Design a protein around this ligand. Sequence first.
Ligand SMILES: Nc1ncnc2c1ncn2[C@@H]1O[C@H](CSCC[C@H](N)C(=O)O)[C@@H](O)[C@H]1O
Ligand SMILES: [Zn+2]
Ligand SMILES: [Zn+2]
Ligand SMILES: [Zn+2]
Lengths: 197, 426
Amino acid sequence: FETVPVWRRQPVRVLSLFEDIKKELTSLGFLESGSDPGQLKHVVDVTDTVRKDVEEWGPFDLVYGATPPLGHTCDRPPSWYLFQFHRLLQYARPKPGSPRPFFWMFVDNLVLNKEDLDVASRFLEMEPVTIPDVHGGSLQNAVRVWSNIPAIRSRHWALVSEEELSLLAQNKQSSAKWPTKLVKNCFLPLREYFKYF
Amino acid sequence: RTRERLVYEVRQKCRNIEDICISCGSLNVTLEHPLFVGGMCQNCKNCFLECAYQYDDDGYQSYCTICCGGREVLMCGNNNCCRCFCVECVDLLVGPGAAQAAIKEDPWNCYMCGHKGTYGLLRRREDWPSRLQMFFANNHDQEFDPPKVYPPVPAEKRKPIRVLSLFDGIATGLLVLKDLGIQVDRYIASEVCEDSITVGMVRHQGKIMYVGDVRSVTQKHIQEWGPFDLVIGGSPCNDLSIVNPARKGLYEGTGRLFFEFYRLLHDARPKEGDDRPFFWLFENVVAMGVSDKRDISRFLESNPVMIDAKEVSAAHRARYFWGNLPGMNRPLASTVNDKLELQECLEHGRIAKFSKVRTQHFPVFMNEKEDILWCTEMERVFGFPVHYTDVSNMSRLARQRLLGRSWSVPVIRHLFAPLKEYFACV
Ligand SMILES: Nc1ncnc2c1ncn2[C@@H]1O[C@H](CSCC[C@H](N)C(=O)O)[C@@H](O)[C@H]1O
Ligand SMILES: [Zn+2]
Ligand SMILES: [Zn+2]
Ligand SMILES: [Zn+2]
């Protein structure tokens, strides 16, 4: 994508699915105040969401979706979040003949199966960048991100062992708070296209 | 046991049948029951509206028409009706032994199709069609396939069709295509079951280009395989249909495969600026939970038609059909060369124990002895050519396994019928 000059950067219009990053996006200066009236359309259960609903919610630039926190209840099977996210994201893309900066991000908190991760990485067309929270040389937490936002593969680490990852999933079970600090920094290269405040 | 005692006190004339709900026995009568004389509550109105389509089993509607419940049911023989009435409701409302009076009728017409409108204490309203017409106004407007159309094309020039088949199995699609007499440029199909594959590699002399899983296929795989005019597929049901205890839903197990179709359809369907005619067809069972069907219709953004082989094939089983094909909801056209009765299918010296089949215990009588349906016959029952499925060393149970999950050839002929006008012919 091509960068956007400072005297042209608009407010960024976001669509937050299943989770709400209104908080982080405001703390990043992407969201100003007052309702917001409105830049971040959040919806938690889009089982009944038609294409027209999305189109009518104003055009979008950023589409964010997350799985539930690690070991948070049940609700619906993990894959639902992924698939639904994909459908609505096709509903959110701009027409081929009217291009424009457009970014999306789905992020999992170690809630997806091995086959579910395969499905995610196949339906979103990239392997996940795994952003760990370490402490004292120990894998405290972890998220994995599928996204087109320009700096993403820039983190991902290595040393987190897929096995050790799936072990860290086992260690933390019943408590559950969504570890947003891990995903917060990914949005930084989006300040090249939208106003700051 | 509120219902039993309440109906019992209805029969003793201590209470009017018009002030109770003849469905669940509630006294909260909100509306008059469309089919019979008596009241109906809001819970049973919603039950009727939702379960009328929730409960349709393969080949029948499985009902019960009255209480929307039931285990053992009496099944109608009228092929334009297909209603059913449970035994408990007949013994309770009509009278004791009235169920055993209803049975012994081999061609049994239900109380809606019958000559009389009065059976025991059960009395049919004279104005029931329009009563169903108004009753069914709160529902089924979210369904029944509102199709949209493409502009026709001139003969010169009109190119051969390019077809992508996800979950092909037995090459039903390429068969119905060749039979329809239209040129096929490329038939690329994705199938796993090696038997199905071999059937295809033989019965079409290798015309089919075979790929692995629907998961093997990439978005790039699609456009690299040339542009596709028609994308067809019937994803395996299993964990979809409710007759399975272990059903993992649309989202787990073998249900997932739907989305793979959903994926490759999207990586296929032409973007804006393409006026190119583009057709797609996704088939599944009608035994699907209402939740999973809701989701599927949402993902495909279209609604399904319930097509039953009954009207033109020798077996009665109905499937949901999603798509954009011309004459989607068009009434089934029964041919001259199509075999309507079971008897038309059996080999020499065998007779039909029924009219149309289900798989109704053993459908064939031979030498005053019951017998299972034959393969060379079952083919006819599904409309496939005789010995179409006789290939390799494949075991009989495997062969029947294959035909058991195939498409009804005349039905697919009915679907692919108005397609010959958009592409090349011989
Ligand atoms: N993961 C997968 N990828 C591709 N095909 C699959 C598959 N899993 C099952 N199948 C195939 O999909 C078929 C679903 S039954 C539908 C077959 C088809 N309607 C016909 O005319 O015969 C089965 O034959 C099965 O072999
Ligand atoms: Zn009732
Ligand atoms: Zn009943
Ligand atoms: Zn009837």
